[PDB]
PDB file of all heavy atoms in Angstrom:
ATOM      1  N   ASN A   1       0.844  -1.220   0.000  1.00 56.62           N
ATOM      2  CA  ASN A   1       0.000   0.000   0.000  1.00 56.62           C
ATOM      3  C   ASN A   1       0.867   1.254   0.000  1.00 56.62           C
ATOM      4  O   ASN A   1       1.909   1.285   0.679  1.00 56.62           O
ATOM      5  CB  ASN A   1      -0.924   0.017   1.234  1.00 56.62           C
ATOM      6  CG  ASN A   1      -2.062  -0.984   1.134  1.00 56.62           C
ATOM      7  OD1 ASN A   1      -1.996  -1.936   0.371  1.00 56.62           O
ATOM      8  ND2 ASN A   1      -3.120  -0.762   1.908  1.00 56.62           N
ATOM      9  N   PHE A   2       0.415   2.283  -0.729  1.00 58.25           N
ATOM     10  CA  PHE A   2       1.101   3.581  -0.823  1.00 58.25           C
ATOM     11  C   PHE A   2       0.103   4.753  -0.778  1.00 58.25           C
ATOM     12  O   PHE A   2      -0.920   4.701  -1.480  1.00 58.25           O
ATOM     13  CB  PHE A   2       1.916   3.659  -2.142  1.00 58.25           C
ATOM     14  CG  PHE A   2       2.711   4.913  -2.295  1.00 58.25           C
ATOM     15  CD1 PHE A   2       3.809   5.151  -1.488  1.00 58.25           C
ATOM     16  CD2 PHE A   2       2.369   5.866  -3.261  1.00 58.25           C
ATOM     17  CE1 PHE A   2       4.551   6.343  -1.618  1.00 58.25           C
ATOM     18  CE2 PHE A   2       3.088   7.053  -3.388  1.00 58.25           C
ATOM     19  CZ  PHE A   2       4.196   7.283  -2.578  1.00 58.25           C
ATOM     20  N   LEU A   3       0.434   5.754   0.065  1.00 57.71           N
ATOM     21  CA  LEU A   3      -0.275   7.036   0.210  1.00 57.71           C
ATOM     22  C   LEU A   3       0.686   8.216   0.073  1.00 57.71           C
ATOM     23  O   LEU A   3       1.783   8.226   0.709  1.00 57.71           O
ATOM     24  CB  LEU A   3      -0.923   7.128   1.611  1.00 57.71           C
ATOM     25  CG  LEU A   3      -1.941   8.234   1.938  1.00 57.71           C
ATOM     26  CD1 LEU A   3      -1.379   9.663   2.020  1.00 57.71           C
ATOM     27  CD2 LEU A   3      -3.093   8.172   0.966  1.00 57.71           C
ATOM     28  N   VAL A   4       0.295   9.203  -0.740  1.00 56.68           N
ATOM     29  CA  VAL A   4       0.954  10.509  -0.827  1.00 56.68           C
ATOM     30  C   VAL A   4      -0.112  11.607  -0.875  1.00 56.68           C
ATOM     31  O   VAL A   4      -1.209  11.432  -1.474  1.00 56.68           O
ATOM     32  CB  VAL A   4       2.038  10.608  -2.003  1.00 56.68           C
ATOM     33  CG1 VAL A   4       1.425  10.292  -3.330  1.00 56.68           C
ATOM     34  CG2 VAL A   4       2.748  11.944  -1.990  1.00 56.68           C
ATOM     35  N   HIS A   5       0.193  12.698  -0.160  1.00 55.60           N
ATOM     36  CA  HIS A   5      -0.561  13.967  -0.193  1.00 55.60           C
ATOM     37  C   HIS A   5       0.421  15.130  -0.216  1.00 55.60           C
ATOM     38  O   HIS A   5       1.396  15.139   0.557  1.00 55.60           O
ATOM     39  CB  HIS A   5      -1.492  14.131   1.040  1.00 55.60           C
ATOM     40  CG  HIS A   5      -2.256  15.428   1.049  1.00 55.60           C
ATOM     41  ND1 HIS A   5      -2.055  16.411   1.989  1.00 55.60           N
ATOM     42  CD2 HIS A   5      -3.217  15.897   0.220  1.00 55.60           C
ATOM     43  CE1 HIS A   5      -2.856  17.432   1.739  1.00 55.60           C
ATOM     44  NE2 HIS A   5      -3.575  17.143   0.672  1.00 55.60           N
ATOM     45  N   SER A   6       0.178  16.098  -1.108  1.00 57.03           N
ATOM     46  CA  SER A   6       0.964  17.326  -1.184  1.00 57.03           C
ATOM     47  C   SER A   6       0.032  18.502  -1.404  1.00 57.03           C
ATOM     48  O   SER A   6      -0.976  18.381  -2.119  1.00 57.03           O
ATOM     49  CB  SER A   6       2.036  17.264  -2.289  1.00 57.03           C
ATOM     50  OG  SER A   6       1.481  17.424  -3.589  1.00 57.03           O
ATOM     51  N   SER A   7       0.350  19.610  -0.734  1.00 56.67           N
ATOM     52  CA  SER A   7      -0.340  20.900  -0.922  1.00 56.67           C
ATOM     53  C   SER A   7       0.631  22.115  -0.907  1.00 56.67           C
ATOM     54  O   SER A   7       0.369  23.108  -1.604  1.00 56.67           O
ATOM     55  CB  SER A   7      -1.409  21.085   0.157  1.00 56.67           C
ATOM     56  OG  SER A   7      -0.806  21.059   1.430  1.00 56.67           O
TER      57      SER A   7
ATOM     58  N   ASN B   1       3.326  21.676   1.953  1.00 56.86           N
ATOM     59  CA  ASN B   1       3.258  20.491   2.865  1.00 56.86           C
ATOM     60  C   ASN B   1       3.433  19.187   2.082  1.00 56.86           C
ATOM     61  O   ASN B   1       3.138  19.128   0.879  1.00 56.86           O
ATOM     62  CB  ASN B   1       1.927  20.457   3.646  1.00 56.86           C
ATOM     63  CG  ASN B   1       1.709  21.697   4.492  1.00 56.86           C
ATOM     64  OD1 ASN B   1       1.924  22.812   4.028  1.00 56.86           O
ATOM     65  ND2 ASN B   1       1.271  21.509   5.743  1.00 56.86           N
ATOM     66  N   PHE B   2       3.896  18.149   2.777  1.00 57.93           N
ATOM     67  CA  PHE B   2       4.136  16.824   2.192  1.00 57.93           C
ATOM     68  C   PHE B   2       3.952  15.673   3.225  1.00 57.93           C
ATOM     69  O   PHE B   2       4.532  15.752   4.326  1.00 57.93           O
ATOM     70  CB  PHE B   2       5.566  16.777   1.607  1.00 57.93           C
ATOM     71  CG  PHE B   2       5.847  15.540   0.828  1.00 57.93           C
ATOM     72  CD1 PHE B   2       5.366  15.406  -0.470  1.00 57.93           C
ATOM     73  CD2 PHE B   2       6.549  14.479   1.405  1.00 57.93           C
ATOM     74  CE1 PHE B   2       5.584  14.235  -1.203  1.00 57.93           C
ATOM     75  CE2 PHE B   2       6.763  13.307   0.695  1.00 57.93           C
ATOM     76  CZ  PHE B   2       6.285  13.182  -0.624  1.00 57.93           C
ATOM     77  N   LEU B   3       3.173  14.627   2.862  1.00 57.74           N
ATOM     78  CA  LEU B   3       2.933  13.423   3.708  1.00 57.74           C
ATOM     79  C   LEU B   3       3.077  12.148   2.855  1.00 57.74           C
ATOM     80  O   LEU B   3       2.480  12.064   1.814  1.00 57.74           O
ATOM     81  CB  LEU B   3       1.506  13.447   4.297  1.00 57.74           C
ATOM     82  CG  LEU B   3       1.013  12.369   5.276  1.00 57.74           C
ATOM     83  CD1 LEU B   3      -0.444  12.633   5.605  1.00 57.74           C
ATOM     84  CD2 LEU B   3       1.084  11.010   4.708  1.00 57.74           C
ATOM     85  N   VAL B   4       3.847  11.164   3.322  1.00 55.97           N
ATOM     86  CA  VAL B   4       3.854   9.805   2.735  1.00 55.97           C
ATOM     87  C   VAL B   4       3.757   8.726   3.807  1.00 55.97           C
ATOM     88  O   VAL B   4       4.420   8.824   4.851  1.00 55.97           O
ATOM     89  CB  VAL B   4       5.097   9.498   1.839  1.00 55.97           C
ATOM     90  CG1 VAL B   4       5.062   8.035   1.331  1.00 55.97           C
ATOM     91  CG2 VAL B   4       5.122  10.431   0.690  1.00 55.97           C
ATOM     92  N   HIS B   5       2.911   7.723   3.534  1.00 53.61           N
ATOM     93  CA  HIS B   5       2.812   6.496   4.343  1.00 53.61           C
ATOM     94  C   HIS B   5       2.801   5.257   3.444  1.00 53.61           C
ATOM     95  O   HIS B   5       1.920   5.119   2.581  1.00 53.61           O
ATOM     96  CB  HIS B   5       1.543   6.526   5.223  1.00 53.61           C
ATOM     97  CG  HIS B   5       1.343   5.286   6.038  1.00 53.61           C
ATOM     98  ND1 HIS B   5       0.129   4.635   6.120  1.00 53.61           N
ATOM     99  CD2 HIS B   5       2.211   4.559   6.780  1.00 53.61           C
ATOM    100  CE1 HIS B   5       0.255   3.570   6.889  1.00 53.61           C
ATOM    101  NE2 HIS B   5       1.510   3.503   7.304  1.00 53.61           N
ATOM    102  N   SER B   6       3.782   4.371   3.629  1.00 56.30           N
ATOM    103  CA  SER B   6       3.769   3.056   3.001  1.00 56.30           C
ATOM    104  C   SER B   6       3.815   1.919   4.021  1.00 56.30           C
ATOM    105  O   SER B   6       4.529   1.977   5.026  1.00 56.30           O
ATOM    106  CB  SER B   6       4.895   2.890   1.966  1.00 56.30           C
ATOM    107  OG  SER B   6       6.106   3.481   2.386  1.00 56.30           O
ATOM    108  N   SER B   7       3.046   0.876   3.721  1.00 56.74           N
ATOM    109  CA  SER B   7       2.957  -0.324   4.539  1.00 56.74           C
ATOM    110  C   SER B   7       2.849  -1.555   3.647  1.00 56.74           C
ATOM    111  O   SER B   7       2.595  -1.477   2.437  1.00 56.74           O
ATOM    112  CB  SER B   7       1.760  -0.213   5.483  1.00 56.74           C
ATOM    113  OG  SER B   7       0.687   0.479   4.850  1.00 56.74           O
TER     114      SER B   7
END
């Protein structure tokens, strides 16, 4: 499993 | 901002 968030 | 989670 992989999660990325960028803002 | 930056967030990563791998499992």
Side-chain angles (χ1 to χ4, degrees):
Chain A
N1 287 20
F2 183 69
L3 192 291
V4 57
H5 179 246
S6 76
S7 60
Chain B
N1 301 45
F2 188 78
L3 184 183
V4 177
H5 178 227
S6 39
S7 35

